[PDB]
Every structure is written in C-alpha cells, then in structure tokens.
Amino acid sequence: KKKDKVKKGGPGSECAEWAWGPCTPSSKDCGVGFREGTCGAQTQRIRCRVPCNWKKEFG
C-alpha cells in the first residue's frame, strides 16, 4: 500500500530561489501538485495547488 506517494509526506523548506521545477499531479491532474528541484547540496519536492489545467483551456 505504498505508491511512492510523492504528493505530501514531508515539508523541507530551504533556498527560496532554488532551481524549483514546476508542480505535477502525481495522482489526479491538479488538486495537490508539488514542484521539484535543487538548491545547493539538497533537492526534493514540495506541494502546490493546481487549477486543473489539464487542457489549459477546454475551447
């Protein structure tokens, strides 16, 4: 019962700038969505809400 839930599971905050890639709906397509990247000698993900832009504009 462990699908590597990368969504939520730990905070970890450091290097405001930090090469922070955009978020990603590890599960649905928005709801929860953590970005992911590197700062200096660390690296990891952090959640971020997502406006369900699966289509970025349905029409």
UniProtKB/Swiss-Prot annotation:
Expressed in various tumor cell lines. In insulinoma tissue predominantly expressed in precancerous lesions. Disulfide bonds join 15-39, 23-48, 30-52. Induction: By heparin and retinoic acid. It is found in: Secreted. Secreted protein that functions as a cytokine and growth factor and mediates its signal through cell-surface proteoglycan and non-proteoglycan receptors. Binds cell-surface proteoglycan receptors via their chondroitin sulfate (CS) groups. Thereby regulates many processes like inflammatory response, cell proliferation, cell adhesion, cell growth, cell survival, tissue regeneration, cell differentiation and cell migration. Participates in inflammatory processes by exerting two different activities. Belongs to the pleiotrophin family. Homodimer. Interacts with ALK. Interacts with LRP1; promotes neuronal survival. Interacts with LRP2. Interacts with NCAM1. Interacts (via C-terminal) with PTPRZ1 (via chondroitin sulfate chains); this interaction is inhibited by PTN; this interaction promotes neuronal migration. Interacts with NCL; this interaction promotes NCL clustering and lateral movements of this complex into lipid rafts leading to MDK internalization. Interacts with LRP6 and LRP8: this interaction is calcium dependent. Interacts with ITGA4. Interacts with ITGA6. Interacts with ITGB1. This is Midkine. It comes from Homo sapiens. The chain holds residues 23 to 81 of 143 of the full protein.
